[PDB]
Structure 1
Amino acid sequence: DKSKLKPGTRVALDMTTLTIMRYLPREVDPLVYNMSHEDPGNVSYSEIGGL
């Protein structure tokens, strides 16, 4: 598709002719993945009274 190119996504292109061999699924930086999984707390996520 022509939808396998959209700004910011990864593409593999041939070196010698610069035509699209394939779609390359975008990298996921491990740093963003750490931020999603981790909770820096050790306190309740329901309530803290008076706050």
Structure 2
Amino acid sequence: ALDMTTLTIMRYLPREVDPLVYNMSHEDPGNVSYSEIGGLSEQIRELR
């Protein structure tokens, strides 16, 4: 981000943008736990 007047660099910023990726990163799944899975055991454990 740069000055409007002299355009000299006022600050660096965290790289990149986009509200869509925010919406992809700010949705909540709710409260879940591995015990609240229907005993897929092996499967769940493999994913762990």
Q: TM-score range by the shorter chain?
A: 0.3 to 0.5
**Alpha carbons of 1:44 and 1:21: their partners in 2 closer, same or farther (altered >3 Å)?**
closer
From the two aligned structures, give the one with the greater strand fraction. 1
If asked which structure has higher relative contact order (CA below 8 Å, sep 6+), I would say 1
Which segments of 5 or more consecutive residues in structure 2 lack a partner in the other structure? 40-48
Task: Give the fraction of aligned pairs with identical amino acids, expressed as a percent.
Answer: 100
Query: 1:26 Cα shift?
Result: 2.7
**Alpha carbons of 1:18 and 1:43: their partners in 2 closer, same or farther (altered >3 Å)?**
closer
TM-score, scaled relative to structure 1:
0.32
TM-score, scaled relative to structure 2:
0.33
Equivalent residue of 1:43, what SS?
coil
Q: CA RMSD in A?
A: 4.2
C-alpha distance in structure 2 between counterparts of 1:39 and 1:21, whole Å: 35
Based on CA coordinates, which of the two structures has the bigger radius of gyration? 2
Which segments of 5 or more consecutive residues in structure 1 lack a partner in the other structure? 1-11
4+ runs deviating over 3 angstroms: 32-50
C-alpha distance in structure 1 between counterparts of 2:36 and 2:27, whole Å: 19
